[PDB]
Amino acid sequence: KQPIGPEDVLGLQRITGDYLCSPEENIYKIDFVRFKIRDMDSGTVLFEIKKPPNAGRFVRYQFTPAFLRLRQVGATVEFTVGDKPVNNFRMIERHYFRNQLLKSFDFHFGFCIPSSKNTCEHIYDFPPLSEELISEMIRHPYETQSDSFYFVDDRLVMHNKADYSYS
């Protein structure tokens, strides 16, 4: 599998047909152990989970119709890192509905402490979706999908996938 940089995903217009890297390429031993999202306009915790072939790289989310009308959500993530220093840790997450790009989020993690648990907060500013897109997304669960690409020093080290229901 050929090497991937940010420029190779920042212009994608469809969900990838397969994972762009193998689990072994995560040489920094980055392991996400907690994920929580809060609606910034209500303080409501929309979702939270703590860690217990896709090898845990695919996740299915069950959200509500109201999620599609949110303005901003804050995601709190906790992850451990191995002994190798991690510099320029970045995540590019792209969402699509039936192969139509909805929004791409580009986040740079703060300084990552080696050999320990780290915490980061990402602010997601949601795109204002058209009424027809919202109706269709509610009507067709799991046809909304995302690719989350993780890079360390401009090299792809992790690739996760997900699909969503707003029913």
From Swiss-Prot:
Tissue expression notes: Abundantly expressed in retina, in photoreceptor synapses and inner segments. Expressed in a much lesser extent in several other tissues.
GO BP term, example: negative regulation of caveolin-mediated endocytosis
Main subcellular location of this protein, as a coarse class: cytoplasm
PTM (free text): Phosphorylation suppresses its interaction with KLHL18 and down-regulates its KLHL18-mediated degradation. Phosphorylated more under light conditions than dark conditions. Dephosphorylated by calcineurin.
One Gene Ontology cellular component: cytosol
Chain segments carrying region Required for centrosome localization: 53-167
Residues annotated for tetradecanoate binding in this entry: Y61
A GO molecular-function descriptor: lipid binding
Keywords linked to the UniProt accession: Cone-rod dystrophy, Cytoplasm, Cytoskeleton, Disease variant, Endocytosis, Lipid-binding, Phosphoprotein, Protein transport, Sensory transduction, Transport, Vision
Subcellular location: Cytoplasm, Cytoskeleton, Microtubule organizing center, Centrosome; Cytoplasm, Cytoskeleton, Spindle pole; Cytoplasm, Cytoskeleton, Spindle
Domain-related comment: Adopts an immunoglobulin-like beta-sandwich fold forming a hydrophobic cavity that captures N-terminally myristoylated target peptides. Phe residues within the hydrophobic beta sandwich are required for myristate binding.
Family listed: Belongs to the PDE6D/unc-119 family.
Assembly behavior: Interacts with CABP4; in the absence of calcium. Interacts with DNM1; leading to a decrease of DNM1 GTPase activity. May interact with GTP-bound ARL1. Interacts with ARL2 and ARL3 (GTP-bound forms); this promotes the release of myyristoylated cargo proteins. Found in a complex with ARL3, RP2 and UNC119; RP2 induces hydrolysis of GTP ARL3 in the complex, leading to the release of UNC119. Interacts with NPHP3 (when myristoylated). Interacts with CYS1 (when myristoylated). Interacts with MACIR; interaction only takes place when UNC119 is not liganded with myristoylated proteins.
Illness the protein is tied to: Immunodeficiency 13: A rare and heterogeneous syndrome defined by a reproducible reduction in the CD4 T-lymphocyte count (less than 300 cells per microliter or less than 20% of total T-cells) in the absence of HIV infection or other known causes of immunodeficiency. IMD13 predisposes to infections and malignancy.
Function according to Swiss-Prot or TrEMBL: Involved in synaptic functions in photoreceptor cells, the signal transduction in immune cells as a Src family kinase activator, endosome recycling, the uptake of bacteria and endocytosis, protein trafficking in sensory neurons and as lipid-binding chaperone with specificity for a diverse subset of myristoylated proteins. Specifically binds the myristoyl moiety of a subset of N-terminally myristoylated proteins and is required for their localization. Binds myristoylated GNAT1 and is required for G-protein localization and trafficking in sensory neurons.
Protein name as catalogued: Protein unc-119 homolog A
